[PDB]
Amino acid sequence: MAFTLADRVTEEMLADKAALVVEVVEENYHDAPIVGIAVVNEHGRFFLRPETALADPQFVAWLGDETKKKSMFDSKRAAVALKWKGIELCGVSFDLLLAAYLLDPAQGVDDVAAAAKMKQYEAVRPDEAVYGKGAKRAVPDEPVLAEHLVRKAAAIWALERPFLDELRRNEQDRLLVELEQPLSSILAEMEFAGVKVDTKRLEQMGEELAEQLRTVEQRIYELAGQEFNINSPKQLGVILFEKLQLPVLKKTKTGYSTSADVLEKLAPYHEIVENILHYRQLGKLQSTYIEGLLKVVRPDTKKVHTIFNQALTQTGRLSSTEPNLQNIPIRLEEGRKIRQAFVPSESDWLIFAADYSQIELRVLAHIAEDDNLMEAFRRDLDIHTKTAMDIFQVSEDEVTPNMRRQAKAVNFGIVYGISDYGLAQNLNISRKEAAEFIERYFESFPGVKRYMENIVQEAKQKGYVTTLLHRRRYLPDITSRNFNVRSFAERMAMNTPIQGSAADIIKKAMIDLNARLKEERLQARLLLQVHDELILEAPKEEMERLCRLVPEVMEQAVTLRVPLKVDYHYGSTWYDAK
DNA sequence: GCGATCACGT
DNA sequence: GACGGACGCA
Structure with a gap:
């Protein structure tokens, strides 16, 4: 495009309405670099280096001014990356990622180019074509980067009206403006705040697990003839169904099934089966939960900062990644104790958990x-x-x-x-x-x-x-x-x-709760959403207020022909909030 | 770099 | 033949 590669911020870059691009290339945007900024408004198209723009007091003022309206794609990514730099983003009145998600969640819109294709706009490249795939990922030189970012901002600028028009035809405009976009800001705060982790308690559990895995892993080797990769369903299948001749109850496309439902039926035939089940459970906890959490916890703050994917599922549920905090074990006690490592971020605070009943x-x-x-x-x-x-x-x-x-x-x-x-x-x-x-x-x-x-x-x-x-x-x-x-x-x-x-109901409940907490001058804050459950932390002196406030706000989020009912618990760790 | 398999919570 | 993190092979 024709655009200005700006060395300094000027007054015409700070108009009352603009498409804004605040580019974070790393997939996990927590504390990640901002590689460039583009602004498109009625006065022109501008690329700014972030070292320049983010130190400019008038630009920072403009980012934080609710009355200066910005149109963006994935404003949560930008809002969070700016939060890590001490900069508030306000006034985002249109998010093209969320608009495209609402218009057709099956499309899998994950960059501006994919959203733009929905309205036959192709004058922008996919992020992957610009940055690369996995290991070959890289930030290109400034002329290439600046054209990409300006082309993304120009696309957002041109696409706001047709997307809003179709949202209105579908009666989804309020769903965008009053539900998903407000929720996006709340999610940003939740991700930025993070959840505190007791890493020494996690490490000692990992140590306990590794010992128990070692003991079961050797018992499996004695019961089989050989040593083998117990974690590869192919090698395990040879052991069970060829070496030990266990009945083949179910096949997979590539071989025999070793799923837990098949192994349980095979347990009476050989002592090895129960050990494989036990190893699978322990290894699940170790590899997915203990190792996964320790890998992504930030060692300076001892917090994990998940990313909620707001624009992914076809039902309107959130998902959570890096770490996924919506499938922490709870059904079996051995895995549930992992929740003891999730603790309040401040001494004399507690974890408060409220869940809709059915x-x-x-x-x-x-x-x-x-x-x-x-x-x-x-x-x-x-x-x-x-x-x-x-x-x-x-x-x-x-x-x-x-x-x-x-x-x-x-x-x-x-x-x-x-x-x-x-x-x-x-x-x-x-x-x-x-x-x-x-x-x-x-x-x-x-x-x-x-x-x-x-x-x-x-x-x-x-x-x-x-x-x-x-x-x-x-x-x-x-x-x-x-x-x-x-x-x-x-x-x-x-x-x-x-x-x-x-999903609609709890998202509205989150918006109502965030507003009510501020109204009531509580320090309590939302940390996690788990589909039908909200996890908060708060000073211990606030628990009695939260016991009354949180269920009422969640129960009153909508009016149905039946009551809604919310149960709640609190304690010193997530595990105790039961 | 991929496809395949298994398993967690809601 | 609901959905959404982690061998095999390459």
Whole structure:
């Protein structure tokens, strides 16, 4: 493009409206370099070196002025990288990444060029073509870098209006401006704050694990003949199914299955199997959680700073990476103790955790208007026990533990939209038997059945389904003549208004909570979101206020035909917040 | 640099 | 045949 390579900041660069590019090339933008800045506004196109621009008091003033509106792509990346430099970014009124995510989350828009292609704009290169792939990644020389950054800013400048126009046609403009963009700032603060980690406690757990892995690893070698890579399903498969001749219950595309569900059925045949299961559990904790956390914890602050991917999933859920903090173990006690290493950032603070109880089935009761399901939540029943009572036609005192377990698994399948092979699998029954359970469910909950039928028809007719706050998911596969592919699209038509509305609700709750915390002059702060749960830390003197405030704000985020209900706990570590 | 397999929470 | 971090091979 035609643009100015500026040696200093000028007044015409600080207009009331601009496309702004604050380029961070490193994937993890925490404390990462800013390699260049581009500004496009009514007066022209400008490239600035960050050493110049970020030391200029008027430019910094302009970045922080809420009344100076900026249009950007992935403003959270820029906001966080600037936070690490002590600079506040305000006034971002349009985020092209989030706009493209809302318009079609299946596109996988991850740079300006991919978003621009959605509106037939191609005068910008993909970041990968400019910087390189993995190891071959590099920042090019200034003339090349400056043209790329100005071309990205020019693209944002030209694309704001067509994206906003389509968002408005879809009734998603408020979803962008009042939900996703405010949430992006809250996520930035959460990531920047980080979670404090007790690294010595993690190290001693790693030491304990490494000893136990060593003991089980040698026991496996004695029970087998040879030594082998227990972590490679191929070598393990030769040992189990050829050397020891265990029955082959399930094959994979490349060989025999050694999944935990197959190994458990093989346990009676040979002592080695239980040890492989034990090794898999321990190795999971060591490699994924202990080693992963120690690798990414910042050694100066002893904090981990995750990155929440706000623009990735087709349901509207967040994801979390580097480290992923949304799948820290909790089901088994050995892994749950890892949560003891997540601690408040200040002495005499505590961890506070609040979770919605059954938000997805409450959402389902609301959208389906199912009388039976609505009444169960209005009575605040144990929904798994109640589902077992209806599915199996027994009174509450005849629900056995196994009945409740199988009803909970049906509830899981309904809440996530898993296939009948999925449900049969984790219930260890036949696909046919799993389908009969679903059948008995629809008979006890005929409103849910009507809703499933109607929403599949709606998806076929409109081409998409929507959530309570107008998030959209397109389902072109709903007319596929491949039965599996079509069934998958049908389940996604059912599931997305459920899981996606629950995502809408907690995102609004986060916005409301952040505003309420400031109103009430609390020091408490949000640290993590885990799909239906919010994790905070606060001075211990604030716990009593948070016990009243947090559940109320989360419960009042939307109004449904059934109440929402939030449980909460607090303690000295994340583990204790139970 | 990839594709494949397994496993964690919600 | 829901979704979203970590051998094999190359």
